[PDB]
RNA sequence: AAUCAAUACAACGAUAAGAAAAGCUGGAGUACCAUGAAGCGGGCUGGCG
């Protein structure tokens, strides 16, 4: 039976994640494609074979300043092509995108600004959202399927947050919610996790506070945006609380698809 | 010639990612490893050989020269 | 050579925005920065080299005189 | 050659010709000048057409053959 | 051209209507009036000129002998 | 080196009169046997004798395996 | 040169290569031989491919560069 | 099958939207995904197989030529 | 033949409810139980036999393959 | 095959089946005999039905399958 | 065994001159007695001779019951 | 084909005006000029070809004998 | 057979023919090509017409019989 | 000009009709189409050329036995099709119906049971009436025209019989039969050929087997020519000659402004 | 004689209804076809013979997720065919529609979203209403009769609710929903089975989960049996008792002067 | 007014079914969007079917 496992992990610094044990954890997950965001390390920094996984290929990109962003990608099979960038400054200069081209389906890692580090960060996040909306409107005409394992740092509905009365903080703002609704409705994209389970408490991000961990005041910042062609192939979805090695819990999603090159 | 050869030499020396558009409209991306009079080695995941007579335009991801 | 080279030189000197059209039909826009025997360098948002054997027509935005 | 005298006859007589590109785009106008590799077609906007992309040239009226 | 030139000369002398397929896929028909190294004069309803580099196949209406 | 591969291959195909498939760049597939050839055109014979320009020929596929001299 | 040593390396190691034509049709097989204009492609049936129609040559596995 | 198979293969490869009319007059629309001797699989809003013995006319949105 | 047999085989194995339109315009619904070269056993409340020469088109409710 | 065993099972058990024709009119009765092209349907009056006009065979009760 | 039943049935209908009603695929009701038949056509006659094609015949309804040979 | 061929041959030789009714109810009239295995040529105002697979009945204006 | 020479005469002479379908719809155009099962009718839009859905072929002018 | 003459005569046995000179009379009437009812002769009985008319075609149907009943029809032109039976026992088993198909318009004859020979006859007559009403309701949706020269053996209105007060107590003028005829005429849209051009009394068609009935003109209008509503304006003239007649039913001659052809 | 009894009950979870004794009550009602809405259970859950009824067949559909659930339908006679969904996502993905095919008339169960749990629910409800209006406009041209046992979750008139002044400000009596029902009833020609025989108030079908609503009779009419205009005259009687009920909706029993058969 | 004065998509359209029209020289198969798609090679025995 066709079975493919895709894992999206926001690390907020790949060095600290590796020091906490992310590599040994990923080695046992038996996943096929691993998606990492916010590595905070340059391409030369990741050249170290310590980050290499047994039986996995490594592709990644970096920004002009490595501490500001940068994403990575692992794959059990050698992809046909590895591309990066969308065509505008907020993605090209920051290296927040990396796409691996497989047969019929294309897996792309995506990273959005946090938006909590100032009004300038919020404006940059809004510009990135608008540019990505334009990109998706232009891209929805293609036939190949896209899997956007993008940590958009924005929750969709009240079921994705705790104590929403969240609306006064970056991550659940009205324009961001409207943008997500537009993406999921007008553009026709389907969320991977919500196509198989409409249950609460499945959060993906927690503030750096003991109260948020104890009271489960978490937000769902991790997403795997699927084209309307792959909404039916979702098999399983999970968001394990522990042993996450960052402020974002790993998002494991299984698909009824056989990956080939 | 006088312009294409220095342009491709600068592109391959700086290792800048370039977008190579073919005549049929299909876009290729990668880093130019080496070239000559007829073919351009576009290297990224696999070292593929691309013929010059089918390339429409080469668009670098960042300004050069 | 008697018409192509002078036309391209005039377009480069006058800095007239030209609309390059490829053989398949994908229209490009920008200003001619330089050229030679086989390629044409077109600059707009980013400098890009356009091969001559893939160009169909060149349409300046304003009339020119040689 | 026969292409050069034919194009020269089309130019001196100012016969409106329709140019079908290699893809299939129909261009209309009058031939103003030409050389070995490009052909200048003038109408409402002056444009240069490359010979390696031209498939057929169809005049609007019969002309003298070389 | 040991083969193309005599074949085209025979087709011109015999005045056989020929079907010519372009690279874009369309088929043109008419009579070969004359030819040189780069173009072929195709006469039918309008005396149109066709370039050799855009011609894919030549289909005469009846078999001929060199 | 010149046409040390194309000319002998086409000469063998012409002498053996093996039916070959000629694929054009626009997607049309032709069938027949090659009567003769030169540097620019190939004479194709089937229902009617037709000439095919080499600059539009993408691939030449014989109907059976052949041996080169 | 670069094209000839690259094709010779592909031929010597018998690496299966994927050859995308200009129209998008993908061929698969190994290189038997090559010259200035044609490439002998081996598969279930022996076929010849013209270089003027080959857009890209994509080997299935990385090889030593010339 | 000298005309049906090449026509359907061209319509499939070119991804041209085709209008398939049944014998009873119901108009179908979409792109041909694949076919054989008896059925034609149409791709539109929902992938649905159309039998050949019920097809009357196939009208592509843009012309094609063999 | 080439693909219609694997198509019906997939529709049978996955048990997808399909809409089968007849030549006269009448729409049927149900599942394929079995088939051969001429008949298709539409299966729901009544296991009826539908002839292929009268089937206008088969429209599954969800995409397959 | 499938049609032959199905019709044989329907004939052996004499299940009253409804046969719908291509024009939409429903026939009623029990299958008496059949061959390759016709099916003898018996009811108030014995009538022969051609297979090329039979659209569906809907029994009144479920029956065994091959 | 293409016509193991249809041919004997038509022969029995013709032997007894039983007036049979032939309904076409379009719903038109024909009447008369079958003069003869073959593999693809059926000869019908009630006032004027008339050949009817089998590919358009839907049902053959005799006006009186018959017996199989 | 023991009855079709002789009947059609007699209708052709005797030049009897025959009425041909199609499956859709359309009534055709004229004289049979010739026929084969699949088409029947009906002559009246225009020598139109009628396909056999669309013909339902043939009604001669006067009785004929084999 | 006589269908093939009739269709050949209709095609080679460029006779505008009207094709009536089984459902009564009237088509118009010129027969571009044909084979055993389909007939390609071209006019303002090139459309393929299946033979099994054709009822009558009515040329606009009389044609020579084989 | 288009002119067509149709004669409908119930013979109650074609043998006595031919013995009384009905065939010669019909040949002398210059009629175009003739419809006969209650021939009481089988197909083998009508094979005798004595019943044949000079220059007229002959088609007929019979029941299991000749004495049971049967109808016949004559036509000057060879019809496109001649059909019999309706699909139920009361007409097919008795052969009381025969229809001739021509261009555009079809002419048909029909025979209804008397119903006076017993209660079972009346029940069979009512069943025949219901089945014929169903057939007419199914047939009225067609485009072609129909001419039903049917001896219904029932009067429609009081103008069709003499002394209707006593006629209501006998089969032929009963309330259910009158309601059935009213339904057939109004609801189904069929028109009477005689009433479209002549709305006068004393135009009877059948007389009982009694000299007093013939003396006092106690006749019943049991014969009708039922036409589709499309041909109501084509009726030119209609005649009901009391004498000479060759059966219990008088001849019914109706002229039309129509040209018969195939 | 001919008699047909159809019952439509919204259960809001078939498990709680079975625990409250819905099946034991339905078994004694002698109904012919039972339509259940909002089962809140997958098709595999209804496979349990606990929900099975003696003398009734069990056909049902389920959504992708069991929380949304689907609709079920019981029938005494084996239907000709069972169809589900309409052809759009808000009905197909949720399985809120099921229709059994019988002769002449077909019975269908329908479930609409509540629309009270968030604005997204109201938007989905409006989309479902528009798509169903399109489907009904396309379907009204057919000849066969349709019986829609649909829980619309929308009131029609003020007589269908208590204290309409406050009902206008809550989902169930909004202006767009009222206009939608008016369009469906007048322009398309569909009729309500309950109003064809009883035009009286207080015949509410749904009550809010509150003791004050039960005591003060603050009920709303959310359940309807939508019929084609051909069956408006065949409605015999309609029964809707206030108690006992096994959910927030009351059982709706409607009798027809029609013989259900295949 | 035609090989898309240069690229390409969307726009809506099938009576779970009439125990059956001796037959109509022929019913019909709009607007708007839109400038580069890691690439879809369709039998028997030359005689026949």
Residue numbers in the entry:
A (entry chain A): 1 to 165, 167 to 262
B (entry chain J), I (entry chain C): 5 to 69
C (entry chain I), E (entry chain M), H (entry chain B), L (entry chain F): 5 to 70
D (entry chain G), G (entry chain K), J (entry chain D), M (entry chain O): 6 to 71
F (entry chain L), K (entry chain E): 3 to 71
N (entry chain H), O (entry chain N): 1 to 262
What wording appears in the published article?
Three Hfq hexamers (Hfq1–3) present the rbsB 110 mRNA to three Crc molecules (Crc1–3). The density for Hfq1 is diffuse, which may be explained by flexible association of Hfq to the translation repression complex. rbsB 110 is presented by three Hfq hexamers (only the two that were well resolved in the cryo‐EM maps are shown) and adopts partial ARN motif engagement on each Hfq distal side. A similar yet more extensive Hfq‐to‐Hfq presentation of the RNA target is found in the Hfq–rbsB 110–Crc assembly, where a short RNRN motif in the rbsB 110 coding region is presented by the Hfq3 distal side to the Hfq2 rim/proximal side. In particular, Hfq2 residues Arg16, Lys17, and Arg19 form hydrogen bonds with the phosphate backbone and the C6 nucleobase of rbsB 110 (counting from the AUG start codon, with A annotated as nucleotide 1). A duplex‐like RNA fold is coordinated by basic patches on the Hfq2 and Hfq3 distal and proximal surfaces, respectively, in the rbsB 110 repressive complex. The Hfq3 rim side can make putative hydrogen bonds with the hairpin backbone via Arg66 and Arg19. In the amiE 105 and the rbsB 110 repressive assemblies, Crc forms homodimers, and three different self‐dimerization interfaces were observed (labeled as 1, 2), constituting a second recurring feature in the repressive assemblies. Lastly, the hydrogen‐bonding interactions of R90 and Y91 in interface 3 of the rbsB 110 complex were tested with the double mutant R90E and Y91F, and found to have roughly a 2‐fold effect on translational repression.
